[PDB]
């Protein structure tokens, strides 16, 4: 029993417990992506400002 328990626990951990490396890599990718997205949006609001120069 004391080894069946460890094998079953290993299986359950593999099913449910996350691997921190992959998650943090994805987190870094999404963080740089959201930074780029918000910067690009900020560039987008000012875009129609050029219209009034001919008003």
């Amino acid at each position: 029993l004391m080894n069946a328990y460890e094998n079953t626990q290993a299986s359950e951990s593999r099913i449910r417990d996350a691997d921190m490396a992959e998650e943090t890599v994805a987190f870094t990718k999404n963080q740089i992506l959201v930074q780029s997205g918000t910067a690009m949006l900020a560039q987008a609001n000012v875009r129609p400002q050029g219209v009034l120069s001919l008003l």
Binding site: L33, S36, G37, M40, L41, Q43, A44, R47
Partner: protein, 57 residues
């Protein structure tokens, strides 16, 4: 000089409108971070990419 129409204005407006459309096309993919978002930019590329994504999953 003719005054009922301004041909230079029309030409400038046309080229400006198409340049602005190109600006929007670049800006949307800058925001998204992917080379192609709407189909037609690369149909074969989109199909291959969908196959590739199914394969990685």
């Amino acid at each position: 000089m003719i005054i009922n129409h301004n041909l230079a204005a029309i030409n400038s407006h046309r080229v400006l409108k198409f340049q602005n459309e190109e600006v929007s096309k670049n800006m949307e993919k800058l925001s998204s971070g992917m080379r192609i978002n709407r189909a037609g930019d690369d149909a074969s590329g989109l199909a291959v990419s969908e196959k590739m994504r199914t394969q990685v999953n």
